[PDB]
Structures are given as C-alpha cells and as structure tokens.
Write a protein that binds this ligand. Structure first.
Ligand SMILES: O=C(Nc1ccccc1)OC[C@H](CN1CCCCC1)OC(=O)Nc1ccccc1
Ligand SMILES: C[S@@+](CC[C@H](N)C(=O)[O-])C[C@H]1O[C@@H](n2cnc3c(N)ncnc32)[C@H](O)[C@@H]1O
Ligand SMILES: [Zn+2]
Ligand SMILES: [Zn+2]
Ligand SMILES: [Zn+2]
Length: 426
C-alpha cells in the first residue's frame, strides 16, 4: 500500500499527493534509477556502478572508459554496459555529453530490460517534455544532442526498429532536460546523473515538504514536514544558496516555469544572501565558476589554493552569510578534508554553521551532512563535548532526511556511540 499517489494538478501538470497523513522522516518511496551514469568530472574517480571512489579503479578492457571499484561491480554492471561499450569503444577519443550517455542507457534499458520498478508510478513515456514552451535557442541545442546521440550510438542503433515504438529522440532529450536528477555521494559531492521517472512526479517548491537523498544510485524520498491527506508533495529542485533571481533563471531555462511560491514573491532571504561589498562578491561569484569546475574534477589542491586567496585575501573580504563567500568556505572545507588538513577544515566548516542554519531551514540533508562533517572534525581533534553536540544535531536532522534505510545513519550512530563513550569515560 503506497503512501503517495499520482494526481492531475490544477496548473502544474501531474503531481504526487499524500494518501495518508505523513510525519517528518517518513519514508515515502525508494527507487533505483531507470538509467544512470557517472558525471563528466567524476569519470575515472568513482566507480561507474556504485558511485564510490576507490583509490585505484579497474577499467573495462574493451572500451577503457567504464571504471569500477571491484570485480563485483564490473561484472554486475556488464548487462547495462554491454551495448554502450561498443559505442564508447568505436568513438574512442570522443566522449559524449553526460545526457547522451544517459539516454543511451535509457534506450537499452527500455529495449532489453524487464519493466523497471523505477517506472511504477510514472514512466519515461509519461515524462513532461515542455516541448511547447522551449525557446528556439533550446530547440537548436536539442537538435545538436539528437545528432550527437545518432553519432555515438551508430554501432548499436541504426534505425527506428532499435528504439521503442514511436520513440522520438528530440522529445526524449527534452524530457531528459527537465527530469534529470543529480546523484550526490554521501559527502554531498555530485557524482552522477540519473532518471527516476516515478520521482519525477514531484513538483518543485522553494520551501518543500519532502526531500530526496542518494545512497549510491539508490534514491530515498522522505517527508520533512507534517503532510495532510491530499496535500501535494514537493521537493526543491535547486541548490538552497541561490537568490530568487537566480532561481527564476534556472527554473525558466531548465524547467520552463515561473515560480509563484511565497519566497519568490517576496525575495525571501535575498538581501542577507548578498550582503557585503557588491564588487567583491561579483568577483567571488566569477571565481566560483573555476573553483566549482575544479571541485567537480576532484582537484582539491587547486580548489584550496583558489579559496584561500579569497578567504584570506589581502583585499576586502565578505561576510560568511554572503552566499558566494559561503560557497567558497564550503569548497575550502571539503578540499581540506580530502587533503587531510583537518584543523583548517574545521575552521572553515565551523564558520559555515550559522549561515547553514539560516539558509537550510527545518530538516535538509545538505545541512545534516555539513553538521556531521563538523562534528566528525571536532571528534578527531578531541573536542568531545562540542563534537557530541554537533553529532547529535546531525542525527536530529538526518533521522528525518536520511533515515534508517540510508547507510550514513549507521556511520553516524558509530560516531555517536564513540563520542559518547568518551564523555562517559570521565
Ligand atoms: O567520512 C566519510 N563520509 C562522510 C563524513 C561526514 C559526513 C558525510 C559523509 O567517509 C570517509 C571518507 C574517506 N575519505 C578520506 C579523504 C580522502 C577520500 C576518502 O571521508 C572522510 O573521512 N571524511 C571526513 C573525515 C574527517 C572529518 C569529516 C569528514
Ligand atoms: C520533474 S517534472 C514534475 C512533474 C510534472 N508536473 C509532470 O506533469 O510530469 C518538472 C516539470 O513540472 C512542472 N513544474 C514543477 N514544479 C512546478 C511549479 N512549482 N510550478 C509550475 N510548474 C511546475 C514544470 O513543467 C517542470 O518542467
Ligand atoms: Zn563499485
Ligand atoms: Zn566497456
Ligand atoms: Zn519559488
């Protein structure tokens, strides 16, 4: 018996609503992807199957593009990699955009695979394409993706008989644009992209009542507020550290809608997000383009050097609640963690704590993980009472956002048991 059901909304297409009253932390749906792939920057850094980094990955001998953490993942990935391997090999120096590799896997799954549990509530066939709202600029880009797909896939797909019935590649890429999910690892680093068609029933809110979290490629959907029978379920499609004008642009460009929520009507939090000298934060926003590019490719030493030049600039500095300053602090913390610079990581991480409390209200998995990183940093440096407070705070958030079905709770319970034994050892 499901706790959620598809319905037709008044003005935003299909959606999902509660069948029964829901409480914070309640598991609503869980799903493997219909199709997924590793992202550009993480290719060769994380396992194509389980999306975990190992220090040394094994490559597929035939294409030498797919890489794996273990014989177990390489062998289990083979049915879903079989046909793309052909194409990646044939096009050896060329690597396709992520969306093209993704759609390749969609087609092979729908052609060769049994009906997917991911499509239980709503199928790839059903997905919104927004084709009557696409701008001419967007259509041109989709036509290029179609031609890229035809080129990449030519070893395996030559005619329409190798696509699902009446499959239209232009429409399929239109669906991919507004229905792709960014898969994050346990540390909330972007590592993959996937389609989860039942989860695509959820409409957007800038102040949502549900949240998704990833455990490898597996997706958990949880309530993060009380929800009444019949109430629409929403998730936030967007990074929380964005102004209403930034959200407007992305929701128009990627999802073809105008957001009517209270936060957009009132520019909620915009003023605080943009405090400090605007010439300084325009420069930092510009620099973040390279910093985030370096981060997506796991280039931690280069990330840290660019962030230090901002955080400890000789020139004017920004308040930590400024969102571009805050993003730099977060990138610097993660770089220090992965570089083993744990004292410097704690300094940057502690500074993000109050801004994260403000900008991630209620129960948000990004804040839960950030607090857990800070508590873990405090535990490794012997600050047991403060670590214990932050690890317990992380648990209060992540019991709602992650839940017992997510492996990171088990890891957090271990830090709580450990840190607690130390306080009681006095
Ligand atoms: O601890 C976690 N994850 C994790 C941690 C917190 C929240 C959410 C997730 O996994 C192990 C992974 C191993 N990592 C070591 C660096 C090189 C790459 C592999 O990173 C870490 O030790 N982190 C870490 C260490 C100290 C303080 C805070 C975080
Ligand atoms: C992931 S799908 C959500 C389900 C979609 N309504 C459907 O019928 O399949 C994303 C699309 O839903 C619509 N949508 C999502 N949130 C919306 C919102 N808050 N207001 C208006 N339309 C929204 C837009 O068409 C968007 O491109
Ligand atoms: Zn693996
Ligand atoms: Zn291969
Ligand atoms: Zn909004």
């Amino acid at each position: 018996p499901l706790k959620v059901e598809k319905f037709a909304t008044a003005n935003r297409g299909n959606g999902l609503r509660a069948v029964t009253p829901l409480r914070p932390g309640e598991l609503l749906f869980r799903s493997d992807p219909l199709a997924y792939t590793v992202c550009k920057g993480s290719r060769g850094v994380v396992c194509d199957r389980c999306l975990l980094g190992k220090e040394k990955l094994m490559r597929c001998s035939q294409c030498r593009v797919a890489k794996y953490c273990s014989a177990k993942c390489q062998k289990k990935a083979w049915p879903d990699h079989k046909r793309e391997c052909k194409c990646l090999k044939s096009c050896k120096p060329r690597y396709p955009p992520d969306s093209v590799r993704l759609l390749g896997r969609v087609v092979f799954k729908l052609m060769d695979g049994a009906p997917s549990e991911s499509e239980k509530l709503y199928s790839f066939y059903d997905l919104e394409s927004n084709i009557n709202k696409l701008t001419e600029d967007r259509k041109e880009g989709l036509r290029q993706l179609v031609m890229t797909f035809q080129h990449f896939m030519r070893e395996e797909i030559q005619d329409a008989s190798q696509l699902p019935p009446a499959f239209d590649l232009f429409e399929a890429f239109a669906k991919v644009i507004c229905n792709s999910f960014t898969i994050c690892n346990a540390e909330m680093q972007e590592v993959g992209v996937g389609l989860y068609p039942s989860i695509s029933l959820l409409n957007h809110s800038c102040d949502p009542n549900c949240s998704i979290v990833f455990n490898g490629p597996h997706l958990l959907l949880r309530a993060v507020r009380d929800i009444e029978v019949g109430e629409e379920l929403t998730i936030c499609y967007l990074d929380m550290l964005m102004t209403s004008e930034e959200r407007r642009k992305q929701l128009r460009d990627q999802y073809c809608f105008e957001c009517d929520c209270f936060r957009c009507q009132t520019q909620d939090k915009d003023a605080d997000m943009l405090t400090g000298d605007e010439q300084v934060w325009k420069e930092v926003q510009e620099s973040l383009k390279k910093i985030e590019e370096l981060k997506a490719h796991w280039k931690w030493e280069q990330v840290l050097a660019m962030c230090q030049a901002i955080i400890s600039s000789n020139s004017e500095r920004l308040p930590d609640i400024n969102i571009y300053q805050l993003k730099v602090l977060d990138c610097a913390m993660d770089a220090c963690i992965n570089l083993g610079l744990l004292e410097e990581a704690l300094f940057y991480g502690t500074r993000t704590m109050e801004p994260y409390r403000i900008f991630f209200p209620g129960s948000h998995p990004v804040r839960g993980v950030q607090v857990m990183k800070v508590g873990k940093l405090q535990l490794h440096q012997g600050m047991f009472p403060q670590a214990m407070k932050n690890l317990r705070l992380a648990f209060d958030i992540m019991r709602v956002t992650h839940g017992r079905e997510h492996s990171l709770i088990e890891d957090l319970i271990l830090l709580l048991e450990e840190c607690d034994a130390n306080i009681r050892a006095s």
